[PDB]
Amino acid sequence: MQPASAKWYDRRDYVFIEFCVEDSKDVNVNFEKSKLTFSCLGGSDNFKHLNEIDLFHCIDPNDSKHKRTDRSILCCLRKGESGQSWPRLTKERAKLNWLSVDFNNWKDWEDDSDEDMSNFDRFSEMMNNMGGD
């Protein structure tokens, strides 16, 4: 078997992993508190894929889910601790050749700097947030 390539990014509450298998079959996703296992048959050659990810920080497997589309399989993991920083996806620091950051959906979400406050749309959100103070 071989790992599927994948991309990832996160947000304050969730971690997102996209397994880039087109025309996937028999997709099996196992969400455990400290581990994610992906298993998939797929592509034109029915190649068997396997990705065992020992996670950086624990998640809530009961608020985790995935959606299969013809283009890719997207997994959404719930962070065990909201606001937790995830500098890397895995527990170990070795680079995995098949894993990369999904820069197109990357956001520096952990950034509350005093950018122009308005920015009306950003502003309105912040006024609605301050409205709850």
In the complex, what is the shortest distance from the CB of residue 94 to another protein, in angstroms, rounded to a whole number?
A: 4
What tokens were used for 114?
Answer: 């005093």
Which one, 62 or 130, has the nearer CB to another protein? Answer: 130
- Determine phi and psi for 29, rounding to 5 degrees: -120, 120
> Smallest Cα–Cα separation from 42: which of 19, 26, 30, 65?
26
Closest contact distance (angstroms) between CB of 54 and another protein is 13
Residues 6+ apart with CB under 8 A from 52: 35, 36, 37, 38
> For binding to another protein (CB under 8 A), which residues are involved?
2, 5, 9-10, 22-23, 69-71, 86-88, 94-98, 100-101, 103-108, 112-114, 116-118, 120-121, 126-127, 129-131, 133
Q: What is the smallest separation between the CB atom of 124 and another protein, expressed in angstroms?
A: 10
Give 62 or 131: the residue with its C-beta nearer to another protein.
Answer: 131
Nearer to another protein, 62 or 87 (CB): 87
The residue among 62 and 133 lying less far from another protein, judged by its C-beta, is: 133
Smallest separation (angstroms) from another protein to the CB of 8: 8
